[PDB]
Amino acid sequence: SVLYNSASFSTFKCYGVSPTKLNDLCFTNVYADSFVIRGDEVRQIAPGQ
Amino acid sequence: TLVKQLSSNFGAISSVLNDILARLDPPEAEVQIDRLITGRLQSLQTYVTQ
Numbered sequence: 001s002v003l004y005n006s007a008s009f010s011t012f013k014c015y016g017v018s019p020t021k022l023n024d025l026c027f028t029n030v031y032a033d034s035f036v037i038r039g040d041e042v043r044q045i046a047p048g049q
Numbered sequence: 050t051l052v053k054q055l056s057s058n059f060g061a062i063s064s065v066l067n068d069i070l071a072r073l074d075p076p077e078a079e080v081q082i083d084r085l086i087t088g089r090l091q092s093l094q095t096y097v098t099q
Contacts, residue, residue: 016062022072025072 013044051096059088 004012004019012019043049058064061081062073069081 017072018077020074 010039012047015047051092054089054092058086060084 001023004022014022038043044049051082056064061069066082066085069085070078073081087093
């Protein structure tokens, strides 16, 4: 709820699950990965592009 | 064969319906439930035909 009720970020599109009720499933593993790019290429964070 | 058929994803996110319901949002859910319903129906019809 800290992350998905902070609206300051620009894109929140979740695959295979859904944001609002992510607070429902209990997870095996979560990997956090970060990087820096241009804001053109937010389409290239996508399956099949 | 009929019982085992329940274990196949049939193209959806996951086989177990209690997880598809409890994972995706409704407006998204309908999609992933659709292929599951059609697959299980076709299996049931083959069973009754034999």
